[PDB]
Amino acid sequence: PAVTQHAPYFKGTAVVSGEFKEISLDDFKGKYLVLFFYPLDFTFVCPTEIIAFSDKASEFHDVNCEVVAVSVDSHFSHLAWINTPRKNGGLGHMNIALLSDLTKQISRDYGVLLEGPGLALRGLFIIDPNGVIKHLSVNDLPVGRSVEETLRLVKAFQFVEA
Amino acid sequence: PAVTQHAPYFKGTAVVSGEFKEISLDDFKGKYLVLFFYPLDFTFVCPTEIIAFSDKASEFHDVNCEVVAVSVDSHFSHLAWINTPRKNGGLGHMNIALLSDLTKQISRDYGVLLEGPGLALRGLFIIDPNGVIKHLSVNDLPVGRSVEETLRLVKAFQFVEA
Amino acid sequence: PAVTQHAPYFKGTAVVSGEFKEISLDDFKGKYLVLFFYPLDFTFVCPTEIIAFSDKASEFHDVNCEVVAVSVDSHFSHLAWINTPRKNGGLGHMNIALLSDLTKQISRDYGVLLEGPGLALRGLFIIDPNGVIKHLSVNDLPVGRSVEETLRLVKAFQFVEA
Amino acid sequence: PAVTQHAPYFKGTAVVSGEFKEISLDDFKGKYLVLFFYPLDFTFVCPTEIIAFSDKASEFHDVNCEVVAVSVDSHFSHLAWINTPRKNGGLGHMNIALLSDLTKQISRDYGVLLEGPGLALRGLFIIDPNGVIKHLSVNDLPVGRSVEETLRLVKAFQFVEA
Amino acid sequence: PAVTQHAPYFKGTAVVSGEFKEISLDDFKGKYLVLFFYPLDFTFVCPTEIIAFSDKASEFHDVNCEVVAVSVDSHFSHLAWINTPRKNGGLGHMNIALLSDLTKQISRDYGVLLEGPGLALRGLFIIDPNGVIKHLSVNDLPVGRSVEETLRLVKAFQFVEA
Amino acid sequence: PAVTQHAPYFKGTAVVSGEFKEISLDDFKGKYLVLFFYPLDFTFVCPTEIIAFSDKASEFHDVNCEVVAVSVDSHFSHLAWINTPRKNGGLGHMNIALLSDLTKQISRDYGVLLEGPGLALRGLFIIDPNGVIKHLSVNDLPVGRSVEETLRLVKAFQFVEA
Amino acid sequence: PAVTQHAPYFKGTAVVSGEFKEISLDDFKGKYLVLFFYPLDFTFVCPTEIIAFSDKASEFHDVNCEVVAVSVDSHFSHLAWINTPRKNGGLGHMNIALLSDLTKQISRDYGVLLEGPGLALRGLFIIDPNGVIKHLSVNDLPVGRSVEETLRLVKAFQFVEA
Amino acid sequence: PAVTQHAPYFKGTAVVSGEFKEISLDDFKGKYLVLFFYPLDFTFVCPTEIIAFSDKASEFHDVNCEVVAVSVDSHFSHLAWINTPRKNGGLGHMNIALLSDLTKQISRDYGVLLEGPGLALRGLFIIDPNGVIKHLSVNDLPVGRSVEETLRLVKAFQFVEA
Amino acid sequence: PAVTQHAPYFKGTAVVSGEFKEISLDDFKGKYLVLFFYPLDFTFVCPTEIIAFSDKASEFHDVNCEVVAVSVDSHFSHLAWINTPRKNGGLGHMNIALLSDLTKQISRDYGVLLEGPGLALRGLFIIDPNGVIKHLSVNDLPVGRSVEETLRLVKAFQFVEA
Amino acid sequence: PAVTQHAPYFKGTAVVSGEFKEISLDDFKGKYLVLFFYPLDFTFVCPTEIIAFSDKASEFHDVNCEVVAVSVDSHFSHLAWINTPRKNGGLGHMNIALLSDLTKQISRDYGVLLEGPGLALRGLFIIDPNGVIKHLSVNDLPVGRSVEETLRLVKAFQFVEA
Amino acid sequence: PAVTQHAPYFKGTAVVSGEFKEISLDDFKGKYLVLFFYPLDFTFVCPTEIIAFSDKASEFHDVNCEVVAVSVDSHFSHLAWINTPRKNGGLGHMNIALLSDLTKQISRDYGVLLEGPGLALRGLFIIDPNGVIKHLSVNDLPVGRSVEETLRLVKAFQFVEA
C-alpha cells in the first residue's frame, strides 16, 4: 500500500444511508476516493474528525470525490454510533459511508493495522479514478487530520492531471 | 518505516549553515524532527515548499523541533542551490538542514525511494525525542505539503504527550 | 569456506520485499555482505535475532553493507513467516532479504549444514566487496548473535581497509 | 518402492494433533496406510487436495485405514500451515497426520524426490497391514488426486483380500 | 520410467481393428496416450476394466487422447479374446488398440514386469503429446482402475497446460 | 569492462544542447566515443578538465570522435552547472554531451563506481565504431586527464586501423 | 573442528604464571574453555585484544571458564612478551595461560593455520565441560574480538544448559 | 588490480644494468613505481615507447619514481634486445629495469594478459610508496603511451598528496 | 605422449626460411619428423646442438625426415637469434624450422614443460609418417643430444619397417 | 618418472654374478646408474644390445657408473639365458646385473610397461648419485640403443657437474 | 644438503638492518655465505654465539663473505630480540642478517630440523660463490660454534681456490 501503486482491493458492509450496503474498491472506479481509518467507535478522541468529513462531504462530491471512513468495528456498532446524537458524544446523521472492517483484513492490507491491540492507525489514502494511491497520511492514535487540507490535496491532484 | 516504530538510522553530509556538517539521527535525540524528502535539486516544482519550511523554521525551533530536508543529490548540489538567489529559481539563504543522500540509502530506508528513476518521493516524517515516528505523509512527485499543517501536527503531538 | 578465501557461490530465491526475487553472490559485488544462517522458520528460538538485524538494517546500509538471512526452508515458508505478526511469534515487516536454501546446497557449501537433521547451524559470514570472507561466527542451534557486535566488526574491517 | 514389495521404512516428526509426534512405518502395522506426498507447504496449488483427505479422514478410519500426508518441509512449517485459517489459503484443523521429511530421505526412498529443486512429486501409496505396497499414483507437481477414488481403492483391496 | 521424463520407446504388433498393425510410441506424437498394462488374456479378473475403457473410448478421442492396452500375450491371443463374445468371458468388439508384448520387453521398460511369473502389473501411464509421462498408477494384479477417474486426469493435465 | 571487449550498454538522460535528450551507446555506432566519468558536479577539483574537453571538442569531431562526460548527478544538476558562468566555478557553454547517471548503473557497469561514497572514479574509455573498448584510463578522484593526450590516442587507433 | 563435535586434542607448553607448564585439553575437563588463537607475538596489531581478556579473566573464572590464548610462537617468545611492559607495546602481567604452538600442530588441528605464512588466524572456540565446541569465531589477521561479547556467549550457553 | 587497492605482488628476473637481478614489488616500498607492460621483444611496434621512457628515466628518479618495463619474454631475450643497437631496431643502453615475466604470472595478476596468444596488453600502472595503485592505462597492442603525460601524472599525485 | 601412441597435435608459428610460417603436425603426415625441444633462445648452452642439426639437416631430408626445433620463445626471438651471426653466439643461417611455443602449450602436451620456470626440457621425439611416436629422449637442461645418433635411429626405424 | 625428479624406488632379485642377489635403488646411492629395460629373454631381437653393454661395462665402472638391465622375466629365466652360449642366441658371461621384474611393478613405475602384452618397452634411464634422473630414452620394441652414445652421455653429465 | 652439491634454495623475510627485507640464496650469488642455524630466540643458551658472529661480521665481509643466522622464529621475534639490550640477555645491535624460518621449510631443506620439537639443530654451512657447499657443522642444541674457527675455514677455502 504505497504511493503510485493500485490501492489494495477491499470489500465489506458499510452503513451507507441509514442502511447496510456492500461496498468495494470497484464502486469507486472513475471517482476520487478519500479512504480513511480511525481506531474505534465510541471513543472520546475520534468523533470530531469524522463529523468534520461528514459536514464538508458535499465539497468533495462537487470535485467528484467520495469519502469513506473505516474501522475494525462491526457495522452494527457503526449504526449505533450514527444513532447516538452528537450532543452525547455520538455521530448523528452521516453524509459519508461508514465501512466495517470486522475481519481486520482491510486495515491489514492498507498496512495501518496495529496487530497488538488490533485496531487501525489514523491512516488516510487519496485514491484516483484508476485506483492508484496518490497520497497517504498516517497519524498515531490520538491526533486528528485537517479536513480542509485533505480537500486541498484532492483538488491539487486534479489540477496537475489536467 | 511505519507509525510507532523507531525511525531508521541515517547518517550523511548536510549543508548546515554555509558549511558542510556530518549529521545523524542521534543528533536529534531529545528533540522533535521533521524529516522530509524531495526528489531533486534544481527542479522547477520543488523550491516553493522547501522555502516555506526555511521561513517558518523558527516557529518549529520554538516548539523544540528541527527541520531537515533531504534528497538523493550531492551535498555540492545542495550548496549550489542554496547559492542560487530565489529570484532565478534558487533557494537562497536556508534556515533548515539540507541533507545529502548521495547513496540513495536514506531514501531507501525510509521506503520513499523510487528505484526506477533513483530519486525520492515527497515523504515527510514527524519523529519524536525518543526516535519514534509519530506521523508520515507521502505525496506523489508533483505536489507540495502545507508547512502550516505540519507545524499544527508537531504541536498536537506535544499536547497529547502532556 | 574459510577466512581469506572467496565465499562460495550461491544462487536462490529470496523474499526481497514482499516479493520473491532471485539473488546470487554476484549481486553483492562491490558491497559488504553479512550472510547469516539460522536453523528453521517458525521455531520459538530464532525470530528475535532475525528481527534484531531487520531493525538495525539501516545502520548496515549506511556503512555499505547488505544483510541476508538464510535457512533450509522454502521461500514460501519465508513469506508465511514474514506474514505472521510479531505479536504471535512471527517476523512481520522485514528489511533484510530472506534467502531460501531448499536444496540444502548453500548451507552445505558454507559448511554449516548439520546433515543429520538437515538444517543449518547459526553461522554468520562477513564478505567484503571483492567476495572475500573476513569473518565467520558459528553458534550451536539454541544461541543468538549480537547484531551490535556484527555491525562493529563490519565497520572495523572498513577502517582497516582505509 | 514398487507394487508388491514392502514399503521402505520411514521415521520422522509429524504434526499429529496440534502436537509433534514421532511416527514410523511400524506404527501402521496391521492397518492400511495411505501415505501421500505433496511438494511444499504454503503453495497456492496444494491445499485443496490435502483438505479433501482431512475431511473424508473418518471414512478411511472406518475401513481401518490411516492417512498421512508428507512433504519436504519442517514440522514447524507444517504447524504454521495448520494454524493458518482456510479462509487465507491455510489448512485449518487437520484430521490426518502431517509428516515432515526435512532430510528429504523419505521422499528419496519412495522415489518421488525431484533432486533438482529438492521437493517431492505428488505420489500416493496404499500400503496394507503387512507393509506391502498394493497401489501407487504419481502425478506431476500441479495436479490433485481424487480422494474418493483413493477410498474406493482401499475398500477394493480389502474386498479382494476376503 | 518416472514422472516428468519421456516414456520409454515401444514397438510391437497390436490388434487395431480386427487387424494386426505395427504401432510404436511415435504414432502418438502430438496426442495424449493412455498406455496401460494388464496381466494375461483369458483371466477371469481382467476383462471388466479393459471393456470399461473400450466403451468410454470415444470420450478420450474427443479430448485428443488415445488408449492402448498391453500385456505379455501374443497378438494371436489378443485376437482370440476379442473374438470371444462378452457373454462367455471374452472381450467382444474393442474400441482401443490391444498391444502384444510377447518379448516382455515393453513391460520391462515401463518397470511393470513381474520377472517371477513373467507378466505385467496393472500399470497405467498418461503420456502427453511430447512423449512426457505426466502420471502413473500401478495396482497389484487383482484390482481394477477407474476409467472415469483416468479420463478426469487427462482432462486435468490439458487444463493446466492452457 | 576491459580492453578488447565491447563496451557495456548504456542509456540515460543527457544535457545535449541546452536541452535534455535520451542517449545510448547505439547512438555512437560507427563513431569514436570518448566516454569519461567524473565524481560530482559543483566540486572545486573537476571543472578545469571538463572545460578542457569542451574547448577541443571540435578537434575530436574532425577526427570523427564524440566526447561524452558522465557522473552520478541528476541531469538537472548538470544543467544548473552549465548555467553557472565559468567565472564563479561553473561550466558555462558546453560543446560535449553531459550524461546523467542517476541510477549509478552506468558507473557500475564500467566498473568505475566507488560504492562506498556512491560516485564515479575518473575513468576514461576510448570506444571504437564497432563498440569495442581500445583504451581505458582510471585516475584516483583528485587528478585530471590531459585532453591533448586523449586526442593523440584517438588519432593513433585510427592510424593503426588502415 | 566444527560446532557440536569434540574439540581436537592439544598438548603443549604454556606460560601459566611466570612459569612454563604442560597443559592439555584434559586439564579443562569439567570446565568451560575459551581457546583463542592470534597470529604472532610482538606484532603491533595483537596486544590490545589479548590484554582485554587478561583483564576480564576473573569474570570468566567466576562463571567457571578458563581462557587460554595460543599462537605458533615458542613459549620463550611468549615469556619475553609477558616480560615487556605494556608501555612499550608488550603484554605485561598476564591472567591467562599463553600456549605455545611451536609445531604449528594445534593451529593445524583447529583448522586456523594459514599454511602459507605458517601462522594462525584469529580463531576463537568456546568448549564446554564435556569437550564439545559450542561456538567458533574466526577473524582475518588484522581485527580484534570483543571480550565482552565472548563473555556474554559463555554465560548464554550455561543458561541454556540449565 | 584496480585503482585504490594494493598492486599485486610480483617477483622475477629483470635486466637491471647489463646484469640480471631479482626484483620484487617490495623493492619499490616507499617509492613511486611506473610498472608498464609491452607485448613482445623484437617486435617492430614496441621499441620507440620503451626507449622514450629510458630517455626521460632520470626525470622520474628526480620526482622519486622508478620505471620498470615488463613483458612475457625470457630475461635472455631482454638482454639480447638491449644488446641490439637502436640503429637496427634494438633498444640499446637502458636506464630502466626490464622485467621478465616468463611464467605469464605477472601479466595475469595485473589482468593484462591476453590468454589467447600468451602476451600482455599495453598496460601501465602508477603505484604509490604504500603499494597502492593510483592510475592505470590499458591500450590495445599496436599503440604507444605518452611518457610525458605519465610523468605529469606522477607529479600530479605527489602534489595532491602534499 | 608415450612410445607407440600418436604424437599430440601441435600448431604454431615457426621461422621456416627467413619467413614466419604456420606449421602443424599435419604438415608432416607421411614424413618422418624429428621434433625436439630446447630451453630458451640466447642461452650460452643451446646453440651448438641446434646448429649441429641444421648442418646435417639434408642427411635427414634424404631419408625422408623433417627436423623442427621448438622452445617457449616468441617467433620474433627466434628470428632475432637466426639473425645473430654464429661468431657472437647466434644461430646464423638455419636449415630446419624453428617453432615458437609462446603459449607453452606444445611443451605442455609433449610433457617436457618445466612448469616452475616455464620452459622446456631437452626432449626429442621421432614421429613416423603415421604420426606415431617411435622414440623419445629427454635430457636435463644443460646437456646436448647427438645429431649423428638421432639420424641412425631414424634410419633404423625405416629399416625395421621394410 | 621424468627428467629432474628422483627415480622411483625399485627392489628385486637380480643375477649379479652367477648368483641371485637382492638389489634396490639404494645400492646405487652415490653412483651413476644406467637402468635399462628390454622386452623379454630368449627373443631373437634383444641379445646384441645387452651384450654390447656387458662388454663396455668396465668403461662405465671407470667413470663411476653401474649398469643394470631389466625385464619382466623371472630371475630363473635370466640365469638360463646367461647360461646359454652366445653361439646359440644366448647371453653368455655377463658383466652387468640382470634384474628380474616378475611383478611387472618396476616397469610400471618407470612407465615403460606395455600393459597389453605385459612386457617393457626399450627404456633407458641415467640416474645420478643423488637418485635424480638426468636422461631417458624410450625406443619401440624392435630397435636397439647405442652403448657408445649412452656412455658419452654419462660422461657429459659428470663434466657439467664439475 | 651435502658437501659438494649446491646448497638448497631458500627465501624468507630477514631482519637486515633494523628493517625487514626479503632475502634468498640468489642474493649471495658470487659471495661466500656462512648460513648457520640456531634453535630458538630468547633462549638462555644461544645469544653468545650469534653475538660472536655479529662482532666478527666485518672480518667476514673483508674476505668477501656474508653471514646470515637462521631459526624457526618469526621475523617479529627476531626484531624483539635485536631490540633487547645485551645487558638483559638480548642481542642488541646486529651486523648480520637474521632470517626467519617460520614455515620450518629452510631448516627442513638443510636437514637440520628436529621434527619432534619443531626447531633447528646448530648447523652451519659454508657456501661458495657458485652456490656449492664446501663445509658443514652440526652440533647438538646446547653447544656453540667457534666464530674464529669458521673464519679460518672460509679463508682456507679461498686460499685453495687460487
> Are the C-beta atoms of I107 and I100 separated by less than 8 Å?
no
Question: Closest Cα partner for B143 from A4, A153, A32, A133?
Answer: A153
Cell of K108: 627442513
Cell of F34: 570518448
Largest CA distance in chain C: 45
| Torsion angle defined by CA atoms of residues E100, E104, E109 and E115, in that order, rounded to the nearest 10 degrees | 140
Which 3 state secondary structure label does DSSP give B125?
strand
Neighbours of F95 (CB within 10 A): 14
H helices within chain H, ranges in order? 47-62, 75-82, 105-109, 147-159
Is residue B1 within 8 angstroms of chain A, CB to CB?
no
In chain F, which residues have their Cβ closer than 8 Å to the Cβ of H48? none
User: Cell numbers 507378466 correspond to what residue?
Assistant: E119
Q: Which residues pair with D35 in a beta bridge?
A: D68, D125
| Angstrom distance (rounded) from CA J94 to CA F35 | 82
| Angstrom distance (rounded) from CA B17 to CA B33 | 18
User: DSSP of D34-103, one letter per residue?
Assistant: EEEE-S-TT-SSSHHHHHHHHHHHHHHHHTTEEEEEEESS-HHHHHHHHTS-GGGT---S-SSEEEE-TT
G partners (3+ CB pairs within 8 A) are: C, K
Q: Closest residue of A to C87, CA-based?
A: A116
Is residue I37 within 8 angstroms of chain H, CB to CB?
no
Q: Closest residue of I to H71, CA-based?
A: I74
> Are the C-beta atoms of K106 and K98 separated by less than 8 Å?
no
Amino acid at C42: F
- Of the residues C64, C155, C161, the best mutation for testing chain F's interface (the one with the most F CB atoms within 10 Å of its CB) is C64
In chain F, which residues have their Cβ closer than 8 Å to the Cβ of C30? 108, 113, 115
Q: Look up the CATH number of domain H1-162.
A: 3.40.30.10
> Are the C-beta atoms of H126 and H99 separated by less than 8 Å?
no
**HEC per residue, chain K:** CCECEECCCCEEEEECCCCEEEEEHHHHCCCEEEEEECCCCCCCCCHHHHHHHHHCHHHHHHCCEEEEEEECCCHHHHHHHHCCCHHHCCCCCCCCEEEECCCCHHHHHCCCEECCCCEECEEEEEECCCCEEEEEEEECCCCCCCHHHHHHHHHHHHHCCC
Backbone dihedral angles phi then psi of residue K161, each to the nearest 5 degrees: -105, 15
Neighbours of I85 (CB within 10 A): 10
| Angstrom distance (rounded) from CA I4 to CA J121 | 10
When computed from its CA atoms, the radius of gyration of chain D, rounded to whole angstroms, is 14
Distances (CA, A) of G126 to G59, G132, J129: 15, 8, 54
Contact E138 D111 (CB under 8 A): no
Q: CA neighbours within 13 Å on the CB side: how many for H125?
A: 26
| Angstrom distance (rounded) from CA H39 to CA H45 | 9
> Are the C-beta atoms of K145 and K123 separated by less than 8 Å?
no
Cell of C13: 530465491
Which of I7, I23, I34, I46 is an active site residue? I46
Cell of J129: 648419485
> Are the C-beta atoms of D12 and D72 separated by less than 8 Å?
no
Q: Closest residue of A to B161, CA-based?
A: A142
| Angstrom distance (rounded) from CA A62 to CA C143 | 62
Is residue F76 within 8 angstroms of chain B, CB to CB?
yes
**Which one of G73, G103, G118 has the shortest CB-CB distance to K77?**
G73
Amino acid at J122: R
Name the minimum distance, in Å, from the CA of B10 to any CA of chain C: 7
Q: Which residues pair with D33 in a beta bridge?
A: D66, D127
| Angstrom distance (rounded) from CA B78 to CA B19 | 11
User: Cell numbers 630458451 correspond to what residue?
Assistant: I40
State which H helix or E strand residue A80 sits in.
helix A75-82
| Angstrom distance (rounded) from CA B69 to CA B52 | 12
The technique by which this structure was obtained is X-ray
Is residue D79 within 8 angstroms of chain C, CB to CB?
yes
Distances (CA, A) of I68 to A37, I25, I100: 91, 11, 10
Question: Closest Cα partner for F112 from F89, F91, F133?
Answer: F133
Q: CA neighbours within 13 Å on the CB side: how many for K79?
A: 16
Is residue A156 within 8 angstroms of chain B, CB to CB?
yes
Domain spans, chain K: 1-162
Question: Closest Cα partner for C34 from C119, C121, C155?
Answer: C155
Question: Closest Cα partner for D43 from D78, D89, D11, D106?
Answer: D89
Contacting residues for K136 by C-beta, under 8 A, at least 6 apart: K1, K2, K3, K123, K124, K125, K126
Cell of H124: 601501465
State which H helix or E strand residue G79 sits in.
helix G75-82
| Angstrom distance (rounded) from CA K16 to CA B137 | 69
Backbone dihedral angles phi then psi of residue I33, each to the nearest 5 degrees: -120, 125
| Angstrom distance (rounded) from CA C50 to CA C68 | 10
| Angstrom distance (rounded) from CA I143 to CA I126 | 19
| Angstrom distance (rounded) from CA A160 to CA A158 | 6
Neighbours of B19 (CB within 10 A): 8
In chain K, which residues have their Cβ closer than 8 Å to the Cβ of H24? 22
Q: Which residues pair with F97 in a beta bridge?
A: F68
Neighbours of E3 (CB within 10 A): 21
Backbone dihedral angles phi then psi of residue I89, each to the nearest 5 degrees: 75, 0
H helices within chain I, ranges in order? 47-55, 57-62, 75-82, 105-109, 147-159
State which H helix or E strand residue E126 sits in.
strand E122-128
| Angstrom distance (rounded) from CA I78 to CA I68 | 13
In chain B, which residues have their Cβ closer than 8 Å to the Cβ of A2? 111, 138
> Are the C-beta atoms of H123 and H36 separated by less than 8 Å?
yes
Which 3 state secondary structure label does DSSP give C81?
helix
> Are the C-beta atoms of B49 and B144 separated by less than 8 Å?
yes
Cell of J136: 631417458
Distances (CA, A) of G38 to A127, C138, G139: 62, 18, 10
Q: Closest residue of F to B116, CA-based?
A: F103
- Of the residues G11, G15, G75, G77, the best mutation for testing chain K's interface (the one with the most K CB atoms within 10 Å of its CB) is G77
- Of the residues D124, D138, D141, D161, the best mutation for testing chain E's interface (the one with the most E CB atoms within 10 Å of its CB) is D138
Q: How far apart are the first and last CA of chain G?
A: 25
> Are the C-beta atoms of F120 and F107 separated by less than 8 Å?
yes
In chain H, which residues have their Cβ closer than 8 Å to the Cβ of F144? 156
Is residue A2 within 8 angstroms of chain C, CB to CB?
no
With b for 16 or more beta-carbon neighbours within 10 A and e for fewer, the G113-152 pattern comes to: bbeeebbbbbbbbbbbeebebbbbbbbbbbbbbbbebbbe
Helix axes J147-159, J47-62, angle to 10 degrees: 30
Contact K42 G76 (CB under 8 A): yes
Q: Closest residue of C to F113, CA-based?
A: C30
CA I91 and chain centroid, separation: 14
| Angstrom distance (rounded) from CA I124 to CA I138 | 6
Chain D residues 98-127 with a CB less than 8 Å from chain E: 111, 114, 121
With b for 16 or more beta-carbon neighbours within 10 A and e for fewer, the D65-101 pattern comes to: bbbbbbbbbbbbbbbbbbbbeeeeebbeebebbbbbb
Neighbours of D44 (CB within 10 A): 8
Question: Closest Cα partner for E125 from E79, E47, E70, E88?
Answer: E70
Backbone dihedral angles phi then psi of residue A128, each to the nearest 5 degrees: -80, 160
User: Cell numbers 483538488 correspond to what residue?
Assistant: A155
Which 3 state secondary structure label does DSSP give F7?
coil
Contact H136 F137 (CB under 8 A): yes
> Are the C-beta atoms of F66 and F38 separated by less than 8 Å?
no
> Are the C-beta atoms of G130 and G157 separated by less than 8 Å?
no
State which H helix or E strand residue D12 sits in.
strand D11-15
Q: Which positions of D are catalytic?
A: 46
Clarify whether I65 is annotated catalytic: no
Contact J143 I149 (CB under 8 A): no
User: Cell numbers 582475518 correspond to what residue?
Assistant: G140
**HEC per residue, F42-81:** CCCCCHHHHHHHHHCHHHHHHCCEEEEEEECCCHHHHHHH
Name the minimum distance, in Å, from the CA of K34 to any CA of chain H: 21
Question: Closest Cα partner for C78 from C40, C130, C45?
Answer: C40
> Are the C-beta atoms of D68 and D34 separated by less than 8 Å?
yes
Q: Closest residue of D to C115, CA-based?
A: D103
B131: left (phi over 0), alpha (psi -120 to 50) or beta: left
Chain C residues 129-148 with a CB less than 8 Å from chain G: 134-140, 142-144, 146
> Are the C-beta atoms of I119 and I72 separated by less than 8 Å?
yes
Backbone dihedral angles phi then psi of residue H144, each to the nearest 5 degrees: -70, 150
Cell of I52: 649441429
